[PDB]
Design an enzyme around this catalytic site. Sequence first.
Site, PDB file in Angstrom:
ATOM      1  CE  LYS A   1       5.553   0.524   3.854  1.00 35.36           C
ATOM      2  NZ  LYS A   1       6.468   0.007   4.926  1.00 35.36           N
TER       3      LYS A   1
ATOM      4  N   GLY B   1       0.836  -1.187   0.000  1.00 35.78           N
ATOM      5  CA  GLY B   1       0.000   0.000   0.000  1.00 35.78           C
ATOM      6  C   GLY B   1       0.871   1.237   0.000  1.00 35.78           C
ATOM      7  CG  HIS B   2       4.805   3.069  -1.416  1.00 34.23           C
ATOM      8  ND1 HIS B   2       6.039   2.814  -1.976  1.00 34.23           N
ATOM      9  CD2 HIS B   2       4.893   4.302  -0.863  1.00 34.23           C
ATOM     10  CE1 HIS B   2       6.836   3.852  -1.787  1.00 34.23           C
ATOM     11  NE2 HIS B   2       6.164   4.770  -1.113  1.00 34.23           N
ATOM     12  CG  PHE B   3      -1.093   5.058  -2.945  1.00 36.89           C
ATOM     13  CD1 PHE B   3      -1.193   4.398  -1.725  1.00 36.89           C
ATOM     14  CD2 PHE B   3      -1.876   4.633  -4.007  1.00 36.89           C
ATOM     15  CE1 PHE B   3      -2.062   3.340  -1.567  1.00 36.89           C
ATOM     16  CE2 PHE B   3      -2.757   3.576  -3.853  1.00 36.89           C
ATOM     17  CZ  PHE B   3      -2.846   2.927  -2.632  1.00 36.89           C
ATOM     18  CB  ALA B   4       3.627   8.923  -6.072  1.00 36.14           C
ATOM     19  CB  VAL B   5       0.367  12.648  -3.048  1.00 34.99           C
ATOM     20  CG1 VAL B   5      -0.540  13.862  -3.212  1.00 34.99           C
ATOM     21  CG2 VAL B   5      -0.350  11.500  -2.325  1.00 34.99           C
ATOM     22  CB  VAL B   6       2.527  13.842  -8.414  1.00 40.77           C
ATOM     23  CG1 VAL B   6       3.308  14.859  -9.290  1.00 40.77           C
ATOM     24  CG2 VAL B   6       3.379  12.652  -8.006  1.00 40.77           C
TER      25      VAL B   6
ATOM     26  CG  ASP C   1      13.085  -5.529   6.663  1.00 39.66           C
ATOM     27  OD1 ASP C   1      13.382  -6.723   6.435  1.00 39.66           O
ATOM     28  OD2 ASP C   1      12.374  -4.839   5.895  1.00 39.66           O
TER      29      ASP C   1
END
Lengths: 312, 325
Positions: free
Chosen positions: A35, A15-20, A129
């Site tokens: 995230k 669940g990982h996005f870019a906001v542009v 990690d």
Amino acid sequence: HSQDLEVLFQGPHMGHFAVVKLARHVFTGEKVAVKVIDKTKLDTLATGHLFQEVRCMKLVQHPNIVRLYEVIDTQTKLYLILELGDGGDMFDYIMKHEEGLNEDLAKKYFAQIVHAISYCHKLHVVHRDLKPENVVFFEKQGLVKLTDFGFSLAYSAPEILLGDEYDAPAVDIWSLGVILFMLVCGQPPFQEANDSETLTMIMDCKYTVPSHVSKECKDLITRMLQRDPKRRASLEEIENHPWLQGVDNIPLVSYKNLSEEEHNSIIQRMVLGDIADRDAIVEALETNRYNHITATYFLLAERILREKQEKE
Amino acid sequence: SQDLEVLFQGPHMGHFAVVKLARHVFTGEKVAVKVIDKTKLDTLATGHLFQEVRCMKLVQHPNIVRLYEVIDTQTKLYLILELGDGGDMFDYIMKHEEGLNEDLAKKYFAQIVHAISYCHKLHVVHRDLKPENVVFFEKQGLVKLTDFGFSNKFTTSCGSLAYSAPEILLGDEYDAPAVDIWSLGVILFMLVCGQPPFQEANDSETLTMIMDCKYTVPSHVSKECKDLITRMLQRDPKRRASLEEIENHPWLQGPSPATKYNIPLVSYKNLSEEEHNSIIQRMVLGDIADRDAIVEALETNRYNHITATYFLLAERILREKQEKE
């Protein structure tokens, strides 16, 4: 109402996005990542430890570590607003180099990695990690940065596989050694057909370094990938290793001390912030554990010394 | 209350892309968010916009940007929209200093008018039609209309002067559809000349050229296209051409048969008295307007969120009844 991020990020339009930010409908460079962490698949004892672990991270500030701008809590989920990279992860880069990177280029990436974790370990932050998948490109800046701090078998130090009590900084040093190997061979140091066969090797700590790898760099790898967490190398050794010389401050917590009124203010602000019960805080600091309390303490300690040096 | 506010207006940073990443790189799974400021807005503007934006959620057309969600807050309004890859049309036309080739203009223009055709039948007008509001979905071959002129605006006057109809510069009541028609004629002109038909050093003389409606078309433009343009660029809105004529001009026809797909049934299927009343009752219950309001708007044949919400709810009733058939 209180599930608005939920309809944006999880709604039916996806669940990982870019906001542009857009300009006349095309991408610009004003961007952040987001995230999304699934609280539900975790207990309330574990969900309480996750939120303290990520809140601590907002205090980390380093050029080679991905900034955490915000944490936004939800009933069901957790949202981290993050710095957004340009050229993917370091694992795909190594996949594009089946027999390794040239050592001079490897040096440049690994120095940045080591400089980052070296900063972490002086502030009692610890990654846990550390994988090439968690090394990220900022190509326009000429940087790599560590992301996705902890809280898959190749990267795990062999003590982790035994389940015995760990010294958390040494596991990063091992994971550092697996990273150096993969930079200079393009292959993981422990890989056999069966997940089981593999495990023996990692326990044994038996790997072959290819003949083209220099004598210096071969030595650095054996100094980080030893079967016993006590024989691995501290970071002053790695930072100054011959292999890394030539490649071109350090945290104030390392060589200066708090005044007692300064020390007391921190522990007071920490309790008022519901970071922990004051008794736990002093057990932690005295035990010298590597967890979000010590980290919180030491990051906050560093912000006061940084202010004290500025005035001067 | 402010979770979206922090995401989009936070220090780390209104039209944004929200894009799925995969190993830290972009994918094609993406949507857009247009943020609308409700401050500097009275209570009746804020009320209507909320229903206009609400009724745009029902529009579905391949040549219109899909409005997936609305999210209201105290200060800002958030429209979750369909995101293009390609930029807008104005930047396309500007790259063509002497216009697009006429058969490419035709392909874009035909798409724009099917968008406006679907709209006007459902009693939706754009009110802000300009090539900045035509977006490229070039992975899918098409252009879609966007940024419908909602109650926030009723782009600023120095900029939009070029694209504005004479009757909205003079300021008197008008047929809103005819204004979209004027705007079609300006777009077609730009498509085939890469220049706006009214432009001067002073923005005061551009105003005069619009009022008198004097412009000149390059020699290489065909006689039919030239003719289509003059049927959309008249100074009298009663003189302009309704969409049947435009949509059936020879420039776009060329005699192939027409697909019933993506055409609103409300234009040929009729409604029963109980259904008509059932809509208005759902509209009254949904607190979109007074029953007088609604019956008045339909009687006056207005173009706004009342009549539009009426013909959209109607079209659903017609589409489900057709499904049973």
